Design a protein around this ligand. Structure first.
Ligand code: TTP
Ligand code: TTP
Ligand code: TTP
Ligand code: TTP
Ligand code: TTP
Ligand code: TTP
Ligand code: TTP
Ligand code: TTP
Lengths: 292, 292, 292, 292
């Protein structure tokens, strides 16, 4: 039984002034609010019960957008992070939400895509012990937590935004944890940067030999909407896929309906209000087309 | 003395579900909120006193983003449009704001760009009588108010969203009016579509021989953020200009400063809070570079 | 042992006038000539011996570009298609090249991408019987060979460019064949459309119960560079992947090297002449980085 | 009467390996060969007699593409530049083509666009003395000839690819010359970079107080297809304009027709062969639509 968390706060600065207008996680990536992406990521890892964290000012807005999740077969809840003091805070704010369950954390501005993605998630959701994260080759490792491998391919060290990255593998923003995480996070101290760093959390598991690091191959897409350029590219990336396939990426209604969290009647009923536009039309069409 | 209006309402359905979390006019075009564009359009027509109209729920968010305009040497005010019942409603809603002055209306999801644009504006701002609009050759005239010319090149008729457009010239979303507009708009009746149509307003002036229709040539760009694709193209269009020139489009602080609505000290001060990101850096650089 | 064919002729009227002077398959997708893509596809299916077919005027060009393939561990050969009379003609023109081997055909303007793409290719290249093709869900099935499935998910019909597609699954431009293909192609007659249609070849296998149709899921990317727009989208799609990952797509040197068809010293030598620019620099970097 | 030159050689290494296969000036920018762009620029400056320079191997291909120009009312000629030894060589290779006339040089991978661009060209093309060039604010002045102004906005120095640019204004690749240029070019000596530099030409005119430097404002688009990314951006830029307006950029047939260098019947005849695709359809449509 795994609970999930979407960390969808932050200040947004790289994007000023676009995001003085709205939290980054409410902006669209092509055709739908950014947060739908990571939401669909948890959903495809089979997690139905999820906690959305954001700023004090934006939390109501996410609530207004997503409601309690029942319409999608989900159980959504909300909490505020008073200040963007680090990804690890997720576990402190989310302590009572998690209780004694397995958990998973995804960053609100991270967008995943690829064939068999859901089998990659599945394998991590199902380890009931230790922690799991994913390594992805990128151009600018210095912008992330970087993971170093020995010649045998084993992970041996982790560094957060190193001036001299030891490899080009970044740890992406998707993390699976067992019941140690809360206590690990309680005992962290701010880093030099002054954050409670998820990298320290991951280092703790590593130092116990309990961190599993799976490679996410060049074949998947792992984009982040951190900068005006990357936001734009992810936008074009999605549009290209959607207009070629006639299938839509990270549309929660669809995923719900394919996982059987809602039935045909429910989907029909999600469609109606949205029927005048292409999104609703797409939802309806799913009721009459078999998609492998 | 011309007052201006930005009609930034609408239900924004073609963009669902992207616009469920919020109003189209708050989304970014590349690097700044959409409404900056039209705002900078009025600003370049030399208009400093401006009414912003939006839905009741979005109104407060515009305010939050633009304040009263004093920091940019503007005088901004706000009004609500309870429902999107037609672009002509702007003149009803805006009646008291206008008083007895000349006025100008720009749609909040309209984006203009081009050499000598501001001379084009100037020439219309300065007619003190009649109305002025602009015609632009487009691919899909049927989506707009279309204007027909006789072989002499004179405008002779206007139709809104005609099934059989009589030409490929659309009237864009930028309108200049003298003091007859409020009364013209008070005597309108909803069209078959059920809107109080700016096209009817324009026809009234045309039937009196007082509508001026200038061509906005192929050289200018007139883009609309109406659909997910066009929104995306507008974003890429701006980013291309900005990254080639190192100059920014529709950055109100800059415009204010160049028009002398604020001085160097003010601009420095606007920069500070935005200094950690590129936008601030750009503002600062304007204090030490001469840009012709 | 399977032999491969890249059909890289056509007239490309859809790209006129861009292709008046030269063949579609020599224009770039972002950073490399188009034909590198499908070449890399055959290479990842483990095919090293390949026949490239083009128009009489462009074949020399391809020769000048790719040479005999030795530098990349390949064995490239060339043949002319005097007129674009159908994709099946690949099997006539290529008869003697094929001899008595298994073969594969890939269209020169098709571009694939995705995780585990190389396992999908492997499975098909190893059948030693019948034929294999791939179905991909697309927006405009009417532009391709379309395959209908029964409720059991079993392929039951195929039509080329139907006005009323029976499904949204298009057969893509990648085909694997056993030793029956040449005789099937010999007995074809021109279609109403005036072509010797691969779709008829595929139907012939289907009629004997020997056509295997695997789904290529929404997780993979299948783009076609047929139109100005799609060619442009394909270019942006590749750049996004390449600028995020720091890895390059369909770079034959790399693939050769990773398959061990050339060694480090050969790669090194392929890099030198290209060292002044990014592509060579990339080839070098591969000698000193481990990429999972 | 001014004669024009398009310098369309180079090795375009920055584009390898895409340009191993085709000169950079033959690759498409969206929907037409790159060279159509600068060709159209000279055409808009009223120049009908034009010399196209390229590498020994690509010249033939340009010939094949453009012919002698008679079909478009132009008089095209060709010459080879044995090696890319500097833009100024244009004037040595073009000496006899030039004779005793005014001349103009445009770089083959330069693309201009903007309202009143044709008036800007006209002004310069009509000076009958001295030289005229254009300064355009850009992000990376260090990659071009850079021009410095004094506080009175008067040009006072020019440097080619300076490590420490004295301003952000690049001299673009469009140059107008009186009868002094050939002699100025004959006395140049190779620069440290080993090129006969047009910047030296321009400086020679500056030292004599006869170089006119006009600003090309942020309102115009000045793009260069020098890198894979910039090529891609230019493509997306043109497509956005073309799909919004239903007009095409730099289509020589149209330009020829609008300038009356060919008549309706000729245009009709250029369209036939191209009638099956959009580009011919567009040429036809111009015979029945008035475009302001
Ligand atoms: C640091 C942090 C990030 N987040 C979220 C926001 C982002 O989606 C994601 C990563 O944020 P970042 O990528 O670290 O960037 P940021 O949102 O802090 O703003 P900036 O670009 O100015 O650096 O995690 C939180 O929710 N709380 C936090 O304390
Ligand atoms: C009609 C209308 C438009 N607008 C704004 C919204 C748009 O920016 C612009 C044009 O509106 P439209 O784009 O014509 O329609 P819309 O904005 O409701 O969007 P959609 O049709 O997809 O639902 O003017 C108002 O602010 N109030 C209005 O009554
Ligand atoms: C006429 C024409 C222009 N262009 C380009 C040239 C210019 O960069 C740009 C602008 O045309 P210009 O005539 O320079 O400017 P414009 O057409 O907007 O101005 P107006 O309508 O008031 O006369 O379009 C073409 O690409 N093809 C053409 O046929
Ligand atoms: C029909 C045909 C195609 N081809 C290649 C060309 C393409 O890469 C691919 C598909 O061709 P098409 O995509 O069918 O397009 P085309 O190249 O025939 O030209 P047009 O756009 O004007 O229709 O197959 C051949 O090599 N020989 C042929 O006879
Ligand atoms: C290896 C390699 C693959 N590709 C392509 C082939 C595929 O479409 C795609 C993905 O490679 P695949 O090997 O299909 O998938 P992957 O690399 O993610 O698999 P793995 O988990 O084992 O690491 O990238 C290249 O373009 N160049 C290459 O060198
Ligand atoms: C099923 C589904 C997938 N996705 C995303 C998740 C995946 O990253 C990506 C790929 O779909 P997957 O089902 O993960 O892979 P696939 O569908 O290609 O595999 P197959 O077709 O053979 O079953 O698409 C959605 O966005 N929405 C959906 O409804
Ligand atoms: C230097 C030179 C350029 N050209 C053309 C090519 C270009 O369009 C334009 C400018 O060339 P450049 O942009 O200076 O560079 P290049 O084209 O040689 O390519 P690269 O730098 O990547 O190797 O001038 C010539 O035709 N002859 C020349 O001698
Ligand atoms: C001055 C300025 C203009 N713009 C916009 C308005 C116009 O659409 C476009 C061009 O402005 P204009 O000043 O009209 O065009 P220009 O600068 O090319 O004219 P010139 O140099 O000959 O004086 O750029 C901004 O976006 N920000 C600004 O600060």
């Amino acid at each position: 039984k795994r609970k999930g968390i979407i960390l969808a706060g932050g200040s947004g600065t790289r994007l000023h002034p676009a995001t003085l207008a709205i939290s980054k996680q409410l902006l669209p990536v092509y055709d739908k609010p950014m947060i739908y992406y990571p939401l669909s990521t948890l959903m495809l890892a089979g997690i139905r019960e999820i906690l959305i964290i954001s700023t004090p000012q934006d939390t109501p807005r996410f609530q207004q957008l997503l409601g309690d999740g029942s319409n999608w077969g989900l159980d959504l809840q909300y909490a505020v992070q008073p200040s963007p003091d680090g990804l690890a805070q997720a576990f402190l704010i989310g302590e009572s939400f998690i209780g004694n369950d397995l958990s998973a954390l995804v960053l609100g501005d991270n967008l995943y895509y690829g064939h068999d993605f859901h089998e990659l998630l599945g394998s991590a959701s199902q380890r009931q012990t230790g922690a799991s994260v994913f390594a992805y080759h990128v151009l600018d490792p210095e912008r992330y937590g970087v993971v170093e491998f020995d010649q045998g391919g084993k992970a041996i060290s982790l560094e957060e935004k190193p001036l001299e990255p030891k490899s080009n593998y970044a740890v992406t923003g998707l993390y699976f944890y067992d019941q140690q995480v809360v206590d690990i996070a309680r005992d962290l101290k701010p880093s030099p940067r002054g954050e409670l760093e998820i990298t320290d959390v991951n280092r703790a598991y590593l130092e116990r030999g309990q961190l599993s690091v799976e490679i996410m191959g060049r074949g998947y897409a792992w984009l982040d909407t951190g900068t005006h350029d990357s936001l734009l590219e992810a936008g074009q990336f999605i549009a290209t896929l959607e207009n070629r396939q006639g299938l839509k990426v990270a549309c929660p209604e669809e995923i719900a309906y394919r996982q059987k969290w809602i039935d045909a009647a429910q989907l029909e009923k999600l469609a109606a209000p949205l029927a005048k536009n292409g999104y609703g039309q797409y939802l309806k069409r799913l009721l009459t087309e078999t998609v492998y």
